[PDB]
Write a protein that binds this ligand. Structure first.
Ligand SMILES: COc1ccc(Cc2ccc(NC(N)=O)cc2)c(F)c1-c1cccc([N+](=O)[O-])c1
Ligand SMILES: [Mg+2]
Ligand SMILES: [Zn+2]
Length: 340
């Protein structure tokens, strides 16, 4: 029962698991490309989720590895590292002072689990791409939140593989509640629901009410689920709020994925999607537009909801924005992607 040097170096990096700016990419390298499994495992022990839900450890490790295995190793952005990142970011948002003792363990389990399965089996192309190209996934889900429905379905389906049912001991009451919450969360990661998600969050802020000493007050399922929906969505759009070296790597990875889709559209003789033309693109103008028009409005509203816990995160966002600034198709990307 004595760790290797590599297991120890990994163990020391995982001491940053509660910190914004976790070196997530190095955890990927140190675990043998198992960032989702070790981060999920660490977070479950930390939060004591194995004892509360009577999840066998062997079953939990088998599920996490199976789930991770269905993330595509050949996709540059929407892979197990992005999965691990969203999970860990959500875990840090969950721990914020203003939300101390607000959420139940089941709710916590839903948010974390949902973050884990939220992009599983992503082919690295968009919903609209899948729809126009007439893919099976599009036909399967009647052109509605195609990828997002597929992520949920695969995530839940993998519970049935050998020794993978990590919810085998929950009651039906818990399982139905977990399921509905997990579905509501993952479906709300459809980017085209962003303005509707932002509108609700704004309303929640304008009318916000607080309990004894600082803590937020959520009185009904709707308000409770809307915060969790926005929490994971914030985690999904968190790259620009991280330290720059991390942010820069995600930008590289997303653009490679985007150009690869553009390459496939051009091959086919299709109209190339906004920001997917490698010969005609400004990464730098895009990201400034990304922050000004989508990322900053979201995270400012989140910062207002949980004031003042997110100021450092929001400072980092503003700093990174100024860095990129000092370096039409952007408009079209934002309209097509974040509007319904
Ligand atoms: C660091 O850069 C990003 C990080 C995450 C997302 C969220 C996202 C992910 C996948 C899709 N997938 C689709 N549509 O297929 C859509 C949105 C982004 F969008 C960008 C990004 C990239 C280029 C231009 C713009 N911009 O102009 O705002 C934003
Ligand atoms: Mg998604
Ligand atoms: Zn995602």
């Amino acid at each position: 029962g004595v760790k290797t040097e590599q297991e120890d170096v990994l163990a020391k990096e995982l001491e940053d698991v509660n910190k914004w700016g976790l070196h997530v990419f190095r955890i990927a390298e140190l675990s043998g490309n198992r960032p989702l499994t070790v981060i999920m495992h660490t977070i479950f022990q930390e939060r004591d989720l194995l004892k509360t839900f009577k999840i066998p450890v062997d079953t939990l490790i088998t599920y996490l590895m199976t789930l991770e295995d269905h993330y595509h190793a050949d996709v540059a952005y929407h892979n197990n590292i992005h999965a691990a990142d969203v999970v860990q970011s959500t875990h840090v948002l969950l721990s914020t002072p203003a939300l101390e003792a607000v959420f139940t363990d089941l709710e916590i389990l839903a948010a974390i689990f949902a973050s884990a399965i939220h992009d599983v089996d992503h082919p690295g192309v968009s919903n609209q791409f899948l729809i126009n190209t007439n893919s099976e996934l599009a036909l399967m889900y009647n052109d509605s939140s195609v990828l997002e429905n597929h992520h949920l379905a695969v995530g839940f389906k993998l519970l049935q593989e050998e020794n993978c049912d990590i919810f085998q001991n929950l009651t039906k009451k818990q399982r139905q509640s977990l399921r509905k919450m997990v579905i509501d969360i993952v479906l709300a990661t459809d980017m085209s629901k962003h303005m509707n998600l932002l509108a609700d969050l704004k309303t929640m802020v304008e009318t916000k009410k607080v309990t004894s000493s600082g803590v937020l007050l959520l009185d009904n399922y709707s308000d409770r689920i809307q915060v969790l929906q926005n929490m994971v969505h914030c985690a999904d759009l968190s790259n620009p709020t991280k330290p720059l070296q991390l942010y820069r790597q995600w930008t590289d990875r997303i653009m490679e994925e985007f150009f690869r889709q553009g390459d496939r559209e051009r091959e086919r003789g299709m109209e190339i999607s906004p920001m997917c033309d490698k010969h005609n693109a400004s990464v730098e103008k895009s990201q400034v537009g990304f922050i000004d028009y989508i990322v900053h409005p979201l995270w400012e509203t989140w910062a207002d909801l949980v004031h003042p816990d997110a100021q450092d995160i929001l400072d980092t966002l503003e700093d990174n924005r100024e860095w990129y600034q000092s370096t039409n198709q952007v408009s079209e990307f934002i309209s097509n992607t974040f509007l319904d």
